[PDB]
Symmetry: C3
Subunit: 670 residues, 3 copies
Amino acid sequence: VPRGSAKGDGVTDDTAALTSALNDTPVGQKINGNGKTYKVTSLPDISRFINTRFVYERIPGQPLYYASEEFVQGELFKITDTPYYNAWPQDKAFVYENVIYAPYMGSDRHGVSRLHVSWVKSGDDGQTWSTPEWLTDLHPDYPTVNYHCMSMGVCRNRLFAMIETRTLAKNALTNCALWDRPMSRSLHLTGGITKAANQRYATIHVPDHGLFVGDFVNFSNSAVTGVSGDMTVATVIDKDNFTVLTPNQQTSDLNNAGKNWHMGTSFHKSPWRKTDLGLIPSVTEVHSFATIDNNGFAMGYHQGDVAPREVGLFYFPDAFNSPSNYVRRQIPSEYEPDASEPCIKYYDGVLYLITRGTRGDRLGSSLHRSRDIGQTWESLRFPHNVHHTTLPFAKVGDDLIMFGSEAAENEWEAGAPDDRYKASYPRTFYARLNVNNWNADDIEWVNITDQIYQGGIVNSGVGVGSVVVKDNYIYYMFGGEDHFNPWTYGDNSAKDPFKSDGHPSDLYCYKMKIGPDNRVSRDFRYGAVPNRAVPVFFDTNGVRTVPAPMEFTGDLGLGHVTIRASTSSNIRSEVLMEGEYGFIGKSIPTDNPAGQRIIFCGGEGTSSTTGAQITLYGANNTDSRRIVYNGDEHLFQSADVKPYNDNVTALGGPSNRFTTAYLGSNPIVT
Amino acid sequence: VPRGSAKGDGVTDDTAALTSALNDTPVGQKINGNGKTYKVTSLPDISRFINTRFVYERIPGQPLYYASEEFVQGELFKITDTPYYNAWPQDKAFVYENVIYAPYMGSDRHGVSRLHVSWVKSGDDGQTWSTPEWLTDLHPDYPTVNYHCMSMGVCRNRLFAMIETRTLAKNALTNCALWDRPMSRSLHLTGGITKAANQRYATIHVPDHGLFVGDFVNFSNSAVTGVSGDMTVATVIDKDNFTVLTPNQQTSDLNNAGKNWHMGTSFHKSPWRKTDLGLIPSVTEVHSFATIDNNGFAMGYHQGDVAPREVGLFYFPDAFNSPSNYVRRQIPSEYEPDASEPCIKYYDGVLYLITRGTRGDRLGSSLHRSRDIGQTWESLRFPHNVHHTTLPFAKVGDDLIMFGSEAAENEWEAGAPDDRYKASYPRTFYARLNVNNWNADDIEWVNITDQIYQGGIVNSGVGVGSVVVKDNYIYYMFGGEDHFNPWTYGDNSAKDPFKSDGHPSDLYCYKMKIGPDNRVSRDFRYGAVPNRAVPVFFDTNGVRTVPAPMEFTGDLGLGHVTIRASTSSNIRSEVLMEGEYGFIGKSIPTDNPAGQRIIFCGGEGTSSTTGAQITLYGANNTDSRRIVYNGDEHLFQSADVKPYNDNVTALGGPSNRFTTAYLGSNPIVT
Amino acid sequence: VPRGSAKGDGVTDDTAALTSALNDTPVGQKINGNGKTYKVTSLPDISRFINTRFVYERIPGQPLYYASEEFVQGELFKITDTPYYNAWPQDKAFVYENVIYAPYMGSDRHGVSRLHVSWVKSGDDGQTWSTPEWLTDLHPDYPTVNYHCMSMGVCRNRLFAMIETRTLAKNALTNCALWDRPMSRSLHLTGGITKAANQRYATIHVPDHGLFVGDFVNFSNSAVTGVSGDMTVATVIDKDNFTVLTPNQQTSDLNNAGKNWHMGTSFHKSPWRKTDLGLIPSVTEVHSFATIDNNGFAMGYHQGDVAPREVGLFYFPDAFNSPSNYVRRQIPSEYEPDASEPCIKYYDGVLYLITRGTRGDRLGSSLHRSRDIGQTWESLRFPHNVHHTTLPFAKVGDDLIMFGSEAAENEWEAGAPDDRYKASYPRTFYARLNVNNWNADDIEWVNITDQIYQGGIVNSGVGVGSVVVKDNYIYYMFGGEDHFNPWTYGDNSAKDPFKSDGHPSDLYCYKMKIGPDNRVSRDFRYGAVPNRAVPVFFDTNGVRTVPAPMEFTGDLGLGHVTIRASTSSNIRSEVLMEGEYGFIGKSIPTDNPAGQRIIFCGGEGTSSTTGAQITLYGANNTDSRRIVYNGDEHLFQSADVKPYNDNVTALGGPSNRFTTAYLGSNPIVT
């Protein structure tokens, strides 16, 4: 009887052959699939394979693909590890001057409670990531409302973001505002600065500077007197020219032609421009961002609270001169039901849009392309009711490369019921779609990594991400959980992130190679003490020292405290108390309440031999509310020594007589 | 002359062939051993091999096995990195609701000084691990005695632990207490809550709840008025039913049958139940834990201080109703000499017990099985005097899979002398033993990873670990050191963990695959800023911000301090001082002692133009112990202004006259 | 037509064949080059290859070699991650008692501003690295001058370092000092302590102890009464014997022959010996260190500010007895032009020296060997004007193994122009040179890893490193950047490390195998919370607790503060203020300035029912500069109650009359 060899054609049932091979081979051998796809009836021990893809119909009629290690050149990274509920990169990520930005929202739930629009960044092509940065503060009217953002990008050297205001009670949208800020850049330029004689303003030529009046600009080596150091834009002449006010004037014209200098900009020292758009009608969420040209961009949106549902985009044709002017453009009505959160991108004059499907029992995600910024569209429906995921994407060559994630295990397929309130391992997929062929019937979703859905609450932070390309790599930034329960059902219904393990949702990045890497590897194993967030150095005396300024906003308990010399040429130690008032008080002692007091002293110890003392006694002291003032002089300056009330308290007592009173005149007795 | 090919049969001396192969092949080639075992006379360059095992008799007559990379599907992780002496997972680890728990002891030595019973946890199947948690405080009678624990596990949804009290002076056992606490769980249930009309108690049906009166329970969506929020157990009816006191009553009966709701529990908001067992006679250590059924469990023990030595277990048949009732069961007397620290597990009605051998020159570790919870036993001795290690284990299929570690390099073998006080690389091993065959003569110890023994002290933290299975992976949690000397012989005989590099012992976990993994990989590279222990966020002003409450118990030096608005609707800043009394004082200045003073001010600066001031002068000041009180009013409220002593001090002086005194009557002169 | 197979001979153009192979093979297949070198016209997708080297002439006539993964057994680690500008390991690294030391300089620029001579260490053969330690403080005359160091090593159990003083303004050398300190060691010894009867000194035999009078020594188990605990050296008899003063005397002679005891030493509790060498003439930098024997060592130097340039070494023949005595030795004059920063090592009586070339358009790096400590030399020039890099090295067998790094991409080659002010990926190389053959014409530079040069400033921290061997591994510790701009051109011209991402330069270590590894792997994945820098433990109450003493030197903002019991058997809470004076003040309130005040209280709350209060009112208060003193007693001790000025202020007022005054005699009215 003949056997029985694996065909790897995606159609022959290779289950038996692979089973035989696994049974016959040592467990530590890596079985090489030679880049082929093997149809099976159940997934085998995938860990024993390299360079293999499996095709499997968990649900009959719905083949999905599963990648062994090394089949794809890619790797998953964990990129945040914070106690906040960290999710929703959707759809905000971008690359700027070699830095990869993964914006997200850190909250305590699916909602805007405790929420800060945030980002982490990578300056090493995704190997390591920065300390989280808050981009927004809590709204001035917290806790009634707070901010929210799913649309962010860059246009002509400025960050643009749709900053939404929503209710904590219901996550209801109350306001839409466009916020923008110049991106920080160093520019190394030649020529372009002029300064007319006998007046103080200088004209700076910087093409597509993206700056507005009041924005920060720093200058070095200008060779134009007064154009130096930290400055601000005084006027904007046009898109390529601006002026600054210098502190001085010269008797001849100045012009730095041929001279090499440096500028200049700062996100952090420039204000946001905030353009109120009000409560944009028929909008549930603004989501995703597509830079169109030097002047503007599009943002996605959907309306999904009332009939009929809308899905489309808002095009801001000139966001520089006219931030408040946009045009609503919808996808074809056929594709709007059961759809939300479109991802949009613009390439080579084509605007591509992919929806999220809302139900696994109705037609789901669809793809659309337009050559007129959304006025007309060509469309396609992904098979099998793709749902619950956004599908962020990029175009690389002739392919859209899209990524998605089920929110919990076994929800991907059409007809698959939601399976929440239990821990699971949700599948993350990618697919390629060739734009010339324009047909998704034979789309191949390849599971490349599995996440965890914790199960302690119905909601999942898994997926809902964002995609960028940098050089020859594509990046999918997205949410995943771990098995640590947030205890929402339990002792932390309030959702305090700083109790127990806080919230399990954190960010991940799948880094996938999409073209040749013509350099030797940059990869390293991280072996350092992470020393950016709280920078610690063992001083010469052997004590951990933190030189960075820091804010501790949570309640602190301290032990022995020494306040060191710090202020006014280090002449003094200094504590400053804010608020309307400060209060320094004394707890009720647990063991000896009768001793309750604070001793204040001008010297080094509790003995009053060391300095003048004032001792405030607490109510619980045996000597209740006593004050003892103990110095070798008591000198009352600038004012009379008075009793608070009139004719109620005395100077001295029968057992506490003053020896006398030195007066400039007799007592005034009335 | 014919050569000379590697046989890989474990018996042919393959040394020459492998040497030839290594000499003839490029160093970067991975030489695949095809899953075979190669006998050699010395270990070759193992790093050049994949999927290879070597058999080597370092000591003639004692073959041991050595694994190349990929021979086993496994990986070592470092799981703690703390300055404490972190060791002794033995034998405490367990898995609960998808979380892997690695309890241990963090101290400053082999002893209970500075000791906290601790754990770290993993919520991602061992890829990353949590911030250490202290489970015990320092004993109330520290530093005479402190806690200790080598036995911990879960039975019917409660953590149970043998909390020992030992002397710091000698590590002598003084007390045994069983401590237990409900494990935190979220339950998603249907029906089961009833509340009789016209009274305030509700009955909650939760099978095997494991709760006691006073334990924490949280309810959501009960559809039973008053059964809501954070509550406590008022009564326990039976193992499956308990009641709570609600705050209200209704005129009809309530019953949430068919309704979906959520509960509820908390380790942290429930007290320990502590059951004093006294100084259990003839016990040196309680060690290891075997859950038997829904009602109870067994804990290991040995007595090794006086003849004759004992080794066995304590069976607690109903630890819920009767925590103080246990039965002592010993292994066969033949196996008690030179033995300690048994590891116990229960599977399919069989109790398995493995000892630690105490000497390499006498019969060592033995294995025992019982079908009657230790009343009768079948036994076997491991060959070659296995010693100095515990042998934690799990049963997977027909195999016990056990793990052990030499404490220092080259101590494993029978007759091998202890080799301490010098740095080395101790071998960690695993073995499989088939329970049907019941014969250890041909046991194969496979070295799968090497640790470091620092050598600065005689003692080693290497090994002494604990084993769990989760899904298709087995986990060995254990100690290892690094080369950083603790300076016990040197400048830190006191063993302060927070000097220099503290103590080199930290925890590791070997994660080994023991069945098929039928999912795509979950593996990630960690690229995040660790932001759980000290959560830092760069605020909108660019300053590192920590929102978590924190306690700093070590001495602190601070620079410039601002106390921000925090308290009473943020109306005030607040400092509260604990103790019997607080003391705020002033150091002797190093450069200008003549200036020694503190200026207290109601306003923003040292100029008294900014607010009222009181200045306390130190004894070293030129104006020694002066007090200057400087306000635009001095108002003395609620009491007479008196001198402390009688007829000793005056009002005013000849060069400091008050202009007059406003009185309601003439001075009373006596 | 025949094809077309890859020859892998380094001379046949294998470009076509490899292109064909890449086109025909699945992308996930690892293409094994079989350890061969393939000539190509452009670098292919190297990531698709294992065990392959490419030879490529980016610049015609200058072949360089490029390694795929696994061609070399090696790995890159990141070893620092600090906001300081962390660079210049050159040329300071060393191994001592199994610990690998990577000293460096952490500053804010190429200069001595904010500079601390620093190190990180590895106690696990380079897998993980310690919290940075500062070795130097800021110079007493900062900010005019500060310290600098490029030469450090160990000789007879002492650390020796050339500590330079340089100007912040220009990095001009002002002073050279030799600093040395005993290295911390634990010694486990037998015999050697004697103590003569009837007197208090004991003689300690410790060969090559390297200690001086006043150095720290700790003793355990001496069996010599009084030789115990923390002690200091009282006298040094010779290199192998020293005495200590014990606190007691005995009537007979004591001698611990045959007894096992422990000693003893401490870097941290021993002072530096500092030997001022003045401004050594004709020296720009002292760089690198070569231990010669038990008595001394050599340090490299160059002079490159004025003609003629010098390059050589300073030999300190007896640095123990005569730290101030050294001899200048130069390399052959032919090799001094365009050269700096020599790396020196001593092996088997041969002193090897390698220069840095300063220009890519003139003869560059050269290699020199001497058998007379630099009096005569044999020499060689590396081809192709090796420049901008130091070439630290070690000798392993017959080979020097050297490492170097271009500072920015495409600068390595002869004639290559500097390419700064733009981000790039600089190549790091190693080479082997056989000392018997003594010919570098055919040297093969192999690119083994690529770094990042950020481009925001002209300067680069890439490279300039140091090399050690430990066991069978060689380590190259060196600088690399990331893409985070320091904003020197932008908002941080001041170079504050603690703004934004600080400085991109951090340290890396390439760990390369150079001999057989005859042990099972020690490798682990790091999965722990890093808990050395800021050690955090979740206390039994669920709050993050830091038990280590810490210094926070940057400005702090605090929220609610509780100062816990800490001092004098925990009887009190304590705050101590340093400086000439302390100041506790109150900010101007933002919202209600009219309330500006601080309430000081002896009890727990703002209600004066809880304790005695003194309230200082600010100038902005409605009651400007009021003080209210509110207690149930006001007791003025130790001094008269006086007005500050004479006959200006009163006791009481017309609406604030004291009831009377209790006096021992009538008022003295004048």
